[PDB]
């Protein structure tokens, strides 16, 4: 490889963030996947402008009751994928919440990319595409919404923030 | 005993019906607890009104995408006891669900109470325990806050809803 990225995910409990995972390191996906214990990560090798990238994507419960996430989780990421349940619209509002543990915990250069997984759920839809790319625009974040389940737009997702940290 | 009343939990996922039972039933409670597969009972007895009710109290998990509590779970249930978690407020939403989904499969006669549990956790309302007890007044519900954690009025909400049952 050219490069090592670590990114993580980081959103609600259940929005989906170990299934992205999954989905992009190891192309499997789980309906009964239970809450992350401690913490994980997987790698995968990508093409970025002509780069062989290392994408070190680090994974972990949502869950901070009486176990807080660290710094050292987020010690040395260059991406974090921010994700919500477009059918949840709770987990949509506690972006801010974790754009504020972002400027907390990671670095000032961060990239940022807002994920609306669970698009499968068109018709469950609590949130509005248009009003989730407009936080987005406001927020300085990129934008996508995905499909661990039915596997659309995840490469994708993960190519794009890839992609932009190494154009930073 | 002298009689034998089947209530039902119910209320969505998180909101600490096993734990209620749990409570209820040994007095144990488990702040690890995770989500309970297929449907249990547990039974106690106790004194209402000079009688020795045993209480035969029904759990199952609150999620139903691809697999929905039937009518069976339901079947000859006198109470139910109809769970939200005065920290979430989306919980307290989906009472209206609930609601639905003990008109369409119990009794006409099941005597239902809201519970808002979770009340340790005060300093995080974001449900006010006035306009809860205005909504059960509005529906024709009984209306208590509990704590599985701490004890605070668990053995009270069973005994309430058991003496409402017997006196109808
Ligand atoms: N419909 C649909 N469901 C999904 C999708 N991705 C994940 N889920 C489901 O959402 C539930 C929870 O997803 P997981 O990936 O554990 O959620 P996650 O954020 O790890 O959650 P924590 O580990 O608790 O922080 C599981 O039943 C998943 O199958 C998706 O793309 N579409
Ligand atoms: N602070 C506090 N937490 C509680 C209380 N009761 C339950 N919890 C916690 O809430 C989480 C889930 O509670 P459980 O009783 O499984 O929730 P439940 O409705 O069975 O949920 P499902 O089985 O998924 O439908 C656990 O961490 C519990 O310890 C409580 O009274 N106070
Ligand atoms: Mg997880
Ligand atoms: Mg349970």
């Known amino acids: 490889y050219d490069y090592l990225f670590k990114v993580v995910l980081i959103g609600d409990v259940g929005v989906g963030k170990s299934n992205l995972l999954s989905r992009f390191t190891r192309n499997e ?3 009964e996947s239970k809450s ?12 970025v402008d002509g780069k062989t990238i290392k994408a ?7 869950q901070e009751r009486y176990r807080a996430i660290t710094s050292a989780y987020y010690r040395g990421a260059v991406g974090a994928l921010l994700v919500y349940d477009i059918a949840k619209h709770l987990t949509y509002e506690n ?9 907390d915990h990671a670095d000032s250069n961060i990239v940022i990319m807002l994920v609306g997984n669970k698009s499968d759920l068109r018709h469950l839809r609590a949130v509005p595409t248009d009003e989730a790319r407009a936080f987005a625009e406001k927020n300085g974040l990129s ?22 940290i190494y154009r930073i």
């Open 29 to 31: 996906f789980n309906l």
């Open 36 to 47: 992350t214990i401690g913490v994980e990560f997987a790698t995968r090798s990508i093409q």
């Open 56 to 62: 070190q994507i680090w994974d972990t419960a949502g």
């Open 95 to 103: 972006v801010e919440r974790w754009l504020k543990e972002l400027r």
């Open 143 to 164: 934008f996508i919404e995905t499909s661990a389940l039915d596997s659309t737009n995840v490469e994708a997702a993960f190519q794009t923030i890839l992609t932009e």
